[model samples]
Target: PFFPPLYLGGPEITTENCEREPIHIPGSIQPHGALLTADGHSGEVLQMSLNAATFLGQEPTVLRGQTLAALLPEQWPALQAALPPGCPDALQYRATLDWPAAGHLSLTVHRVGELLILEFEPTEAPHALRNAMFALESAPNLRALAEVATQTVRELTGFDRVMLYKFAPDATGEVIAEARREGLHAFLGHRFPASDIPAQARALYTRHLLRLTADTRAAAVPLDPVLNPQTNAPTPLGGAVLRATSPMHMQYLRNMGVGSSLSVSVVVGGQLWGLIACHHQTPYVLPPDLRTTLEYLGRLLSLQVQVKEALEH
Candidate 1:
């Protein structure tokens, strides 16, 4: 969620200020996953999360100085090849680990400056799709589609409020459809200015596709040094899923009484169409498998949105 920095009692929100916002390098994870930032060329771990040893099999003290090839001998080659030169886009891979008790793992690899960051998520069997998806697919009109999409996501993820937020011609937003608990205030039809979502965050949504805040009030764990050890600059977090959000954005969520949120991008014709914004009144987290499932549903909705708009035209 983006809002004017002034809303938080700061200076006017400018593109430069948005670009410099510390959101990208929040240096923390949700405690459910482990993160490692390593040299792209050497594959040596330079920085890691405090909980990394649980899956990486080494204490943070030792892990930081080790090489990926030395750390996970079997998976190193594939993981290395997955890293692209200059970070074309983020990449995700599925692999299995042995020494850590033989479990499935999902890895998101992307570059921040010259460092290759690998995020590790433990996975179970793939989750099956829910019947609500079929209903979403069969909705007869754009309004029906948006309505079903919000309700379906709320039912699937158990979010307290699910809104199908649509972008206007000028990039501002309006909630066209919504699903909420009985006691919650309806955000349906409320409009927000474009400054609410800065240009940088919008650019990231085009690539990352989904954003989740497990607990809005939870203090973010910071990455030590906050900069790449080699580059001596704050690492770019455009591709990081667990990246910490701006303080102003967190405060905005709190103002709205939202404890957690999951936003799935709705794209059409290669542009950001809007968002399926899910908000929970209390802290809530989506499991890895369920999060993956929501991503697929987001893609499904994107396609449906294109078809519906074409028909209207």
Candidate 2:
């Protein structure tokens, strides 16, 4: 819990420190979901996020030495039957815990060497994608699709505005299209400096398609030990759903008067293309299933955009 953050020097985010910031290992995570780091061999929970008690139904200290069974008593039988040894996959059984009751959740698990990481979130039937797909197909061209994407994202999430943010050859970004509620700030046709998104952050967008900042003022929860007993280092949460965001990013959002935000990558031709960036004036959060649906929509945009590129010069 006392691990040193990877920030260099002064607390203020400057041109010099922003680019070199190691956001990959934030040493903390958003409190939207609970997390646990357990050993692959013994299944003992070695570390937990500080918010584990609020979401996971037990204090971090009490759960530290508990086994995986202690986390999910209702679905432990099936979990043991088909436990994954490597790679990342969600359980098909759709775990319903004794504490949370009736509300079904999919346990997302990832393995790094002998260390296993598990994330918990509320998941239910996803019904938002059907209308989204229809709206996307109705668009006549790439420009029309970009407009529709902003609108669709705004509708799906509760964001006040959504912008189809595209990058230039020089790596700067522009708000190509905008969708927003009446009486709010408009940023259409505005250009942003490349320093707004550094190299390491861009690299992560291609792999972790969806990233969210539920509340700019919320504090991040660090793992209890900050280093796993099995791996002797903090777990690499490359694609973790509840991964903590960079503090500089939180500062950027606060300066923009944004209370909450979400961004999904729009990669095309197997390269980073643009992003569907959404912003809210107040703190907001949707279920994990909606997040997954938006990421799917992001991929569809990439496919549609690529097809348009082939049809033109």
Candidate 3:
């Protein structure tokens, strides 16, 4: 049996009220499955993001962020070969696309600011990564499988920084596994500030399965209900804490200069296990299906962590 380890208490901190702002993105920018950007000349999976829900009935894992050659059924190789020249190989060509899961995608390359964005549209919904995640369940252990998990999410979702963050009993964090798209800073073994996740926030992470913040803009979740955890009794707002409040917390993150953030909570043996942190330099959004797929992958990792722990014990 996997025994529960000592639970460490996190420092006291508060979160302010955060409310959902109006969804302001234009409809055309919306993707049915996944969206991504790549080196205009190389077409590597430089950046990618997705919606797992698109694969409700279909197998999502088969394609994911894999190259066009890999994602396409063998019969379609000829059509896949007909794609543009900027993509170095089938995989790289797929990187330049923001295609749909079930339907076809119309690709357009354009320059926005200094980066190139490849917009895509889907005629129908498909679940590519979800299916892939299930296949991962067959893997032997997290140690054996972490890299694939990290790469899978990076491809499925276009976050530049993807890492497997192990949560200490005290809420201290570390990067146990990681992967990144080119041009992004490496997060391997880097330490996050203690205040990055105060006691209350860590506790909330216990309850919240996974978090996705495409844009760091207005904190959608509220922060006011939070309270410092060190106090004798849980603050009345204690249970009510809904969002991050520390200006210092934001400042601390800004000091590091990371752009967007996504963290998925994973648990093993009924105890807090770890998280997968996805970071980017710009605001990003994933379609419903892609988001759903990431959560599924996160859960699969949670199970892998549990199984690994049990075997180790």
Candidate 4:
């Protein structure tokens, strides 16, 4: 039921040779690749991006043209059977396998012409972020909320860092509250451009309060003009566990070095307020009940974030 919105940073491919040859994005900001198989045997696996190198320690180029049997363990052969045949349109699947880098990657598999496009990341954050978000619902003040909010997100989502990004009336955003994983950089006092989340994106946030199950290698949900038929009620677009995520959005998140995300909208008095941007360093999906609980917490976080922003001024 949970289908999170994923923002992609796009791949290293360009108009000149994206189709002719496989291109890699070459950094942790993106970690996607492609594997081609002719007949049940792995042919060539191309490494496209490598943002995960900071944590995973695998050389991006080392995996290029490698056979699946060599890269993935024998236990993972089940995944090979799922590939779409004969270039039946480009399709992506989330697959997990033991790897020299980070032990495993939650990857997206795609079929492009004759090539199998594969992309993935870790799956450590979805549940963690959801749990922390649920905990924020009980926090007493912004301080306690910030402390728990930050720490919880870090523990649950396992991002290189987690921050409580608060927004000002002027459209500026700042990391007023934060929690960073022990080995990562700090974001406590960082500031982001007002445009990181544009006006249209912000408006859409209030309209649809939650986004989840995001992965960088997958696509994001498409914008539909018709509101869900269950419109009167809060029809969770991606926060529901059983719901499928948009492949494009997932790819976007992976490209951004965010394997998964839980963006809970904090609207105040029926207006756009702020958000608790939960990031994980891996691909993830939440249980149905977990997402529902997160929805409840998002409302509470809204109040806490609003109060903090007001006090700061």
Q: What overall lDDT goes with each candidate model?
A: 0.76, 0.76, 0.49, 0.51
Q: Look at candidate 1 and tell me the lDDT of residue 262.
A: 87
Predicted structure 4: lDDT? 0.51
Candidate 3 or 1, higher TM-score: 1
TM-score of each: 0.85, 0.87, 0.51, 0.46
What is the Cα-based TM-score of model 3?
0.51
lDDT of 4 at 294: 60
Model 3: residues >4 Å from true position, as ranges? 1-127, 192-194, 217-248
- Quality of model 2 by C-alpha lDDT: 0.76
Candidate 2 lDDT over 55-112, as tens digits, reads: 7666547788788776656555555555666544322223434455436555666666
| Candidate 3 vs candidate 4, TM-score winner | 3
- Relative to the unseen true structure, what is the C-alpha lDDT of residue 310 in candidate 2, on a scale of 0 to 100? 68
List the pairs of residues colliding in candidate 2.
none
In angstroms, the error of model 1 at 246 is 1.1
| Residues 63-110, model 4: lDDT tens digits | 544566665565336555666456333233555556565665555454
Superposed model 4: Cα runs more than 4 Å off: 1-141, 154-160, 219-255, 305-313
